[PDB]
Design a binder for this molecule. Structure first.
Ligand SMILES: C[S@@+](CC[C@H](N)C(=O)[O-])C[C@H]1O[C@@H](n2cnc3c(N)ncnc32)[C@H](O)[C@@H]1O
Ligand SMILES: C[S@@+](CC[C@H](N)C(=O)[O-])C[C@H]1O[C@@H](n2cnc3c(N)ncnc32)[C@H](O)[C@@H]1O
Ligand SMILES: COc1ccc(-c2nccc3[nH]nc(C4CC4)c23)cc1
Ligand SMILES: COc1ccc(-c2nccc3[nH]nc(C4CC4)c23)cc1
Lengths: 380, 380
């Protein structure tokens, strides 16, 4: 009845995550001035370069140089010794207006509640009762290990740390009537960029004592747990210098760490009309509402859309055998309690608010009581 | 017992898919001259621009201008009237050597069979007996609809078609002892870029008669099937002009259309040492071998790695209740029959061969008898 499952997370300075945070800093800058901004901002990062590419139609006047550099400063890349510096990097902009053909088919001359989906696509929401926040333990622990590295870097405890990091956690689970129960941590990987002076033994000792022990409960760690700490042996070159980053290349880290399912759409740099983000947030909200409402212990929700059409084309629910209700019954409850048109999701989840940069590291789900994390009281 | 499931696909001229094909054209160009090239080529596409960003260490002498332009010509973007032209677009190159810190930790001074994984990560393989090629019907049909559009564009049957397209198929399934049985097609979406002269009614009639009827068996289509054909109403602006493209933004289209699971890693532009691609191909090979071998009807395989370590950190198998063997028994069969070190997968799957551009549109799986699609005869 036991099995292993692995998930990973990355830090704020991982190059792909830098791009997600910059794309959402650009989105938030537009929404601060124009709540109805149409934004599709992709970011690319390589040695010394941030490139913004995409489509924005907005009444805002945004200083992209300032917005980009402030996001990079927050992450911690502030000196050429670290491989990247917000003060002196190149910021290139290739942003055009939203295609008028998309605009006419999606939102022009449409009542807000009846706006079409901004694209076709499929999206999933997932929730599990294995943690209070209704997220898989593998991904929660992986995110917390990266957050702990950033905390110790920022407080000067481990001054050799740099912003680029990756973690990976394998947990041994027990199957429990469709639900899953974590038993123990089988393997942990941590790789983090570091300065030239610190030795490997000092880093491995600190990663075990100050990072892992400060995050993972001792009850999950035993004599058999395997640790791969700085497994490459050297990670001085990092950030965009070590690996090109792009927006929307960490979509599994952003969601459920491999659990549930994913429809392929990226979240960062997109306004509410792009259902890749708004409908995935709404599907998480539905899934978490079904679990917190006591209808299931674990659930997956799929929705899909066509560009220009407001109502979802399909809606499906899988409860893994953890509900006494059938899928037909759960779908009826969802129909009576939720309206998954993008023009209604925007109102329910307050999706014109400029809080998106806060979602772009450490996962979009299971944190900070964002609107999609506050369960809806269900009537049935 | 019935449920709906939706998957999507995109055409060769969808901007993200253009990037995947260019990244793999670059990889193949290097492998033609240097089978041991270390390649991590990301591509970005926006109006008039192809940018290559990433890391390559290779003995090859590659003309990036020629390679990029030839890939764009093949796709069909050959005139400014179509929104993009291989002859006159900008090709920008920001490629550096592979980080020496990665090289020393992964492959320098290592026996080939004992090379480390090129990164950490998790990967999944999936197979289902619902089609002969062991793929979900939703994604197979979605890919075939895009392939049919390209065929009719290239043969001059529908000369108003342009290369950028997206499709989406929703199928109603029956649950069958853990396996799934397709019953009927519930909804089809097709959006395709077109010339200025053709009217909406002519396009909708052609998409139903010449595309859908030529691909989807009539037994799956009935009076209740919903069709969303050119649902935006106008799609003249397309390709990179309509939407920025990036490599590795169609990872669900590249794999199982939402079925199974995904670990987050992109495939295109990466050599075999990047386990995001090689271990996902090996996991598909294992899953398809278990189904064709008669051990299960449907199966999911997870593997994970740490950078610099050759053997997977974890291996898991889920048979959805479709096998008489336990996960422990299936794992033992996999251990006796497969070696999932990257330096052994390269030999089994011939991963230094320059066939990667062929994988970069219409899915990496279920087509053309690539090595990961030829089942291994299992001994047990
Ligand atoms: C290993 S790199 C990806 C492969 C790379 N594109 C190449 O050229 O081989 C992927 C991520 O791993 C991390 N990384 C970079 N250099 C590393 C090193 N020396 N050791 C461990 N992890 C590293 C960074 O987070 C980076 O974004
Ligand atoms: C709708 S666009 C994505 C949203 C876009 N970035 C924006 O600015 O709103 C995504 C994909 O849809 C397709 N597309 C582009 N223009 C379209 C149109 N007018 N009608 C339908 N699909 C379109 C292309 O395949 C494109 O890559
Ligand atoms: C996409 O979400 C999932 C999550 C969990 C399982 C699963 N449940 C029970 C026993 C199992 N053994 N191995 C696995 C998975 C790792 C291959 C597995 C399956 C799918
Ligand atoms: C990730 O792969 C899957 C695939 C299929 C199912 C599933 N099986 C039986 C009944 C169901 N109803 N809805 C669903 C899914 C669409 C939400 C579903 C679950 C997960």
């Amino acid at each position: 009845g036991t099995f292993l499952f692995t998930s990973e997370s990355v830090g704020e300075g991982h190059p792909d995550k830098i791009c997600d945070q910059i794309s959402d800093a650009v989105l938030d800058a537009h929404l601060q001035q124009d709540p109805d901004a149409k934004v599709a901002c992709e970011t690319v990062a390589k040695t010394g370069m941030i490139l913004l590419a995409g489509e924005i139609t907005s009444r805002a006047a945004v200083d992209y140089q300032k917005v980009v550099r402030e996001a990079v400063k927050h992450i911690g890349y502030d000196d050429s010794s670290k491989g990247f510096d917000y003060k002196t990097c190149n910021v290139l902009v290739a942003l055009e207006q939203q295609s008028p053909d998309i605009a006419q088919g999606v939102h022009l001359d449409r009542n807000e509640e009846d706006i079409g989906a901004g694209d076709q696509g499929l999206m999933f929401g997932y929730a599990t009762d294995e943690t209070e926040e209704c997220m898989p333990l593998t991904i929660v622990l992986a995110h917390k290990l990266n957050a702990k590295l950033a905390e110790l870097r920022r407080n000067g405890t481990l001054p050799w740390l740099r912003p680029d990091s990756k973690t990976q956690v394998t947990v041994q689970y027990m199957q429990d009537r469709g639900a899953v129960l974590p038993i123990r941590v089988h393997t942990i990987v941590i790789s983090v960029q570091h300065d030239e002076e610190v030795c490997l033994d000092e880093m491995r000792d600190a990663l075990k004592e100050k990072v892992i022990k400060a995050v993972v409960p001792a009850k999950y760690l035993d004599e058999d747990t395997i640790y791969h700490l700085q497994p490459s042996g050297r990670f001085v070159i990092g950030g965009p210098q070590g690996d090109a980053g792009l927006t929307g290349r960490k979509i599994i880290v952003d969601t459920y760490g491999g659990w549930g399912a994913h429809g392929g759409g990226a979240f960062s740099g997109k306004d509410y009309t792009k259902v890749d983000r708004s409908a995935a947030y709404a599907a998480r909200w539905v899934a978490k509402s079904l679990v917190k409402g006591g209808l299931c212990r674990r659930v997956l929700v799929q929705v899909s859309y066509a560009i220009g059409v407001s109502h979802p084309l399909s809606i499906s629910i899988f409860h893994y055998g953890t509900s006494q209700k059938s899928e037909r019954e759960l779908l009826e409850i969802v129909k009576k309690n939720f309206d998954l048109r993008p023009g209604v999701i925007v109102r329910d989840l307050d999706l014109k608010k400029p809080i998106y940069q806060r979602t772009a590291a450490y996962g979009h789900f299971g944190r900070d009581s964002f609107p999609w994390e506050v369960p809806k009281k269900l009537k049935y």
